[PDB]
């Protein structure tokens, strides 16, 4: 089957700038069967271009497709506020039909360092059989950030999950929460809880931590 490879994964531009999105096929696609779609959060995809270069009904002429063979491009000549979204290419010249993995066009701004906050399990939650430790990274850009948990300075893995907000419509930043989950018994067996954050906005990694008790 044909693998569609989109790049870059994230394109970071200011409103008004030109966006060039690439879609490469692992083997030659007939042009007649290459499409591009746009998708905004919680909405369905919508077709922009089919047949590699034909614009769908009612799509603004700032969107244009080109390419052939293995190499296709979606160009947005200037980005309007509603054009910040995720874009997918798809081949349907063969079956299975396949989609690229998507490119997210996000708003570029200046680097902002996160504010880091750590919350021990609440006293109330410690009545339960589980303890959740929560680390907040507030209002940072770019999106790339690493959160590392350590328990008595043992690096943790398999036992945390994280979540990120959409880009703020006012300041264009992201916020992130990471939660470490342990059994209350495990929580009691250890003393030092640290969350270690790395972000290009920070000279060197920032650690917030506490001691249980």
């Amino acid at each position: 089957e044909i693998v569609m490879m989109q790049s870059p994964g994230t394109l970071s531009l200011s409103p008004g700038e030109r966006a060039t999105l690439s879609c490469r096929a692992s083997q030659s696609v007939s042009s007649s069967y290459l499409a591009w779609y746009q998708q905004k959060p919680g909405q369905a995809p919508r077709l922009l271009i089919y047949g590699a270069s034909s614009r769908a009904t009612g799509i603004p002429d700032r969107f244009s497709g080109s390419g052939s063979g293995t190499d296709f491009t979606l160009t947005i000549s200037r980005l309007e506020p509603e054009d910040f979204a995720v874009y997918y290419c798809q081949q349907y010249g063969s079956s299975p039909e396949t989609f690229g993995q998507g490119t997210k066009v996000e708003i570029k701004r200046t680097v902002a360092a996160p504010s880091v906050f750590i919350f021990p399990p609440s006293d109330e939650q410690l009545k339960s059989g589980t303890a959740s430790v929560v680390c907040l990274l507030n209002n940072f850009y770019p999106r790339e950030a690493k959160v590392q948990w350590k328990v008595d300075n043992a690096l943790q893995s398999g036992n945390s999950q994280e979540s990120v907000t959409e880009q703020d419509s006012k300041d264009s930043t992201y916020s992130l929460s990471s939660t470490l989950t342990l059994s209350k018994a495990d929580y009691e067996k250890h003393k030092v809880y640290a969350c270690e954050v790395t972000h290009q906005g920070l000279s060197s990694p920032v650690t917030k931590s506490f001691n249980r008790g």
Binding site: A35, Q39, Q90, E97, P121, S122, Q125, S132, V134, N138
Partner: protein, 216 residues
């Protein structure tokens, strides 16, 4: 021309689901229908489609033997039935068709249904436990172990600036958790009250949690 899909479904592992996709005008008779799904946080995945000019229905290899795509007699409602459901099949399922059915010989997929959420889980309805995240300072509420989505949070209801309510995370237990946080001036603590207001409609849960300074 819109495609109306059937509504959201919560299903147990091993069960089956049949999503409908009704055309508000015309039929699918010349260009067929294609179904696509999208797992939470992931890309689009072709499941299959009808191609009338070849008189075939094609299915993606991962689903062969457990997926059927069909239409009603008049071909103005199409269906995707997916059997032996597992939790990885949790996704939004979309149908898409061709406005010419109201060269380019195939369905160009310019008309899209609104999507149908299918959540596959052996969990039962369960309201969340709401725990305060005690404290410019930051504080919040952890809204833990609920099923199914969604919950709503606000901070009554003055405070909106600096609030971040995160997307829920699906835990390995099969229940959801999320946090809602807000940053405020340090000076305000103990000079102003802060309460998170949580609703989980599917359980019958409303919780109002005061978030107070830890004062050792």
């Amino acid at each position: 021309v819109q495609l109306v899909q059937s509504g959201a479904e919560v299903k147990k592992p091993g069960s089956s689901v049949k999503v409908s996709c009704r055309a508000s005008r015309g039929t699918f008779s010349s260009y067929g229908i294609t179904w696509v799904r999208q797992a939470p946080g992931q890309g689009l995945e072709w499941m299959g489609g009808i191609i009338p000019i070849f008189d075939v229905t094609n299915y993606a290899q991962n689903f062969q033997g457990r997926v059927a795509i069909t239409t009603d007699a008049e071909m103005s409602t199409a269906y995707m039935e997916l059997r032996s459901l597992k939790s990885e099949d949790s996704a939004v399922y979309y149908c898409a068709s061709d406005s010419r059915d109201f060269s380019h010989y195939y369905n160009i997929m310019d008309v899209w249904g609104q999507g149908t959420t299918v959540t596959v889980s052996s969990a039962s309805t369960k309201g969340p436990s709401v725990f305060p995240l005690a404290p410019t300072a930051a504080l919040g509420c952890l809204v833990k172990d609920y099923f199914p989505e969604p919950v709503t949070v606000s901070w009554n209801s003055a405070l909106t600036s600096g609030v971040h309510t995160f997307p829920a995370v699906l835990q390995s237990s099969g229940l959801y958790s999320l946090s809602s946080v807000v940053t405020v001036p340090s000076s305000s603590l103990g000079t102003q009250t802060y309460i998170c207001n949580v609703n989980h409609k599917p359980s019958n849960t409303k919780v109002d949690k005061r978030v107070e300074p830890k004062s050792c």
